[PDB]
Assembly symmetry: C3
Homo-oligomer: 112 residues x 3
């Protein structure tokens, strides 16, 4: 029906998890320089980000069917699950920011 809509420069919105992972990647392979040799590889395959931190292990950040969308598999802090609260990604278990976590775990790996 509504002709007035489809004459706009329309676009489908992004998956809100997709927006974060893309932002995470470039803000991680820019951080893959300030490694001594300690955060060698970042790779976003196809909705799956893999991070290698040889001190801790292999990270897996994952885009997941609901019951809340972003999946953390940390070889240090274990698994966790995140969805939107007020625009940042938040743990279903305790309420901790996803960003805040790999902030610590990366800046510990660089330090140690």
């Amino acid at each position: 029906v509504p002709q007035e809509v489809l004459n706009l420069p329309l676009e489908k919105a992004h998956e809100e998890a997709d927006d974060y992972l893309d932002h995470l990647l470039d803000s991680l392979e820019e951080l893959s320089e300030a490694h001594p040799d300690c955060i060698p590889d970042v790779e976003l395959s196809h909705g799956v980000m893999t991070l290698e931190i040889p001190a801790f292990g292999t990270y897996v950040i994952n885009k997941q069917p609901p019951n809340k969308q972003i999946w953390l598999a940390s070889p240090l802090s274990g698994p966790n699950r995140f969805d939107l609260l007020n625009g940042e990604w938040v743990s279903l278990r305790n309420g901790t920011k996803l960003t805040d976590i790999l902030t610590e775990e990366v800046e510990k790996a660089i330090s140690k």
Copy 2:
């Protein structure tokens, strides 16, 4: 198995987004009278509500697969996403009520 259940006047529950859109429509095509000629059409196609406000443009309210269920496409305030908090629909971005928004945008369109 459990025979005691299926002798009740059973019914499948409604989609909680469906309950809102139905309530929104009649509470909008009742509001499509107090237009000068300024909020001409409301139409709920099949899970898609279309609102025409010629001042701003064509609105689209939409029922969306999870990562949170009701989708706002406002030609004035942009796009947004809503799910249940304590029984009212709330923006994933900032936390604003969906009802509270098209309250303003309609009562501005009538005013101006």
Copy 3:
């Protein structure tokens, strides 16, 4: 690609609703002893828990596609819907704990 992952004792995570229902069942068929003859049966069919409380009726606890995952059908307090807040299951309508509800409804059935 990432060889370091798949040499771990890997396992797929559980459905967070599944973890609760399993915990609910054994913590209910242990409670199906301290009935006079008043909470006779508990049964978890296949993602569907059925509770018979002859005073009130037949309960149905249910695992549901998102727009929030655990479904309560109480013959006393009506229907409700639950998802994770800070690690416990919470009503979309009002914000009440799922655990807190069948706590009351069971310990009323034993009492009365």
